[PDB]
């Protein structure tokens, strides 16, 4: 089991490096745009021409990189926790057999060890673990809000604001209040940054809740 | 200039709300500030660093203060393997009654949080032994932050 996981760890480091190293060396320029240096580290894109240039700034190379970092560190901490959580119980056979097929990781680590966490509060009562049960879902909620900014891009929301900024300008008793700063949808880069902020926060809080509750539930 | 942000004129005249969002993300990027010079670039960084040390020392004076005002540090020493280390106390006025009971543990009198940062063992090893060592430990770091 420890053989196969280590390559999965090794896969993360190269692929994570590949994005970052590809970002660094092509920062000054490349064939798709050989004067990328004239725009800075972070710029949105370069327009639809030449076949479309979405996600070309060296910034975006850092952007995609973080996803592979969280996945990679996901595969590392997962491995450390399960190997130790079987050891501390003196049940070392369970890891050494289940850890060779994926359903073993999904059944015997995720599904099995979260039995005490999700009962933090039920229609029967609550426990000390309730706060970790709440944060657990709170992790799922922020993470799922992250997708909203990564998938849905700006031009849609901008047309949505304009209708809204018309409705507010015609409603009686509410045309007496006027924005000082005009309302516009977030910029293209901002959405990526904002979208990644949610994804990371939700990804840390979710795992951090499961890690503490499941272990402290048994204290062993 | 003429308004927030003071360090970027191009953003200042942006009328939309874009200015506010972008006046926060580009605060610390000292190169792209307007009218920057290589002497300022370093002198801001040097002053900013001391700001980051102030936070680190103030942060660590928080831990010592609570562990020695609401914690189990003197009791935990007496049996490290059966006394949950205590991080701080809980006062949340939304709590109902069965939660107040549930979060009362570690030999406290009200709700508490169990400390999982492992400070309790580290300070045991490096020689701290009562609450009082911790209080002066708090004051000193607070002074270093000042």
């Amino acid at each position: 089991g420890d053989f196969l996981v280590h390559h999965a760890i090794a896969l993360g480091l190269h692929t994570t490096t590949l994005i970052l190293v590809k970002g660094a060396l092509d920062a000054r320029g490349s064939k798709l745009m050989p004067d990328k240096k004239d725009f800075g580290y972070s710029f949105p894109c370069d327009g639809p021409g030449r076949g479309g240039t979405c996600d070309i700034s060296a910034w975006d190379a850092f952007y995609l990189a973080v996803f592979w970092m969280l996945n990679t560190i996901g595969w590392v901490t997962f491995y450390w926790h399960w190997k130790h959580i079987t050891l501390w119980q003196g049940n070392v056979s369970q890891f050494n057999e289940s850890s060779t097929y994926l359903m073993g990781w999904l059944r015997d680590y995720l599904w099995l060890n979260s039995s005490q966490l999700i009962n933090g509060y039920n229609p029967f009562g609550m426990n000390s673990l309730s706060v970790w049960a709440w944060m657990f879902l709170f992790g799922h909620l922020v993470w799922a809000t992250g997708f909203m900014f990564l998938i849905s891009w700006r031009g849609y929301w901008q047309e949505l604001i304009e209708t809204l900024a018309w409705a507010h300008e015609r409603t009686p008793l509410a045309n007496l209040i006027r924005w000082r700063d005009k309302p516009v949808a977030l910029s293209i880069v901002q959405a990526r940054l904002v979208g990644l902020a949610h994804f990371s926060v939700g990804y840390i809080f979710t795992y951090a809740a499961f890690l503490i509750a499941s272990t402290s539930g048994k204290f062993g | 200039e003429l308004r927030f942000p003071r360090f970027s004129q191009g953003l200042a005249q942006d009328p939309t709300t874009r200015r506010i969002w972008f006046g926060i993300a580009t605060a610390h990027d000292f190169e792209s500030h307007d009218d920057i010079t290589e002497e300022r670039l370093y002198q801001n960084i040097f002053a900013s660093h001391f700001g980051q040390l102030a936070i680190i020392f103030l942060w660590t004076s928080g831990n010592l203060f609570h562990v020695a005002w609401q914690g189990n540090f003197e009791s935990w020493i007496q049996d490290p393997l059966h006394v949950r280390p205590i991080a701080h106390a809980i006062w949340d006025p939304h709590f109902g009654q069965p939660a107040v009971e549930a979060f009362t543990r570690g030999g406290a009198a009200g709700p508490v949080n169990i400390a999982y940062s492992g400070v309790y063992q580290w300070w045991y090893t490096i020689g701290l032994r009562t609450n009082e060592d911790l209080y002066t430990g708090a004051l000193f770091l607070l002074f270093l932050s000042t």
């Binding site: - | 003429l2 308004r3 927030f4 006062w91």
Partner: peptide
Amino acid sequence: NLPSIFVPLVGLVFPAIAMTSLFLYVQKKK
């Protein structure tokens, strides 16, 4: 005792004065 005073102050008052202080500074014009 002391938490019952300091928790609201940092939870309710200190936020309110903070938000209202920034809002004027952000929205100034000179």
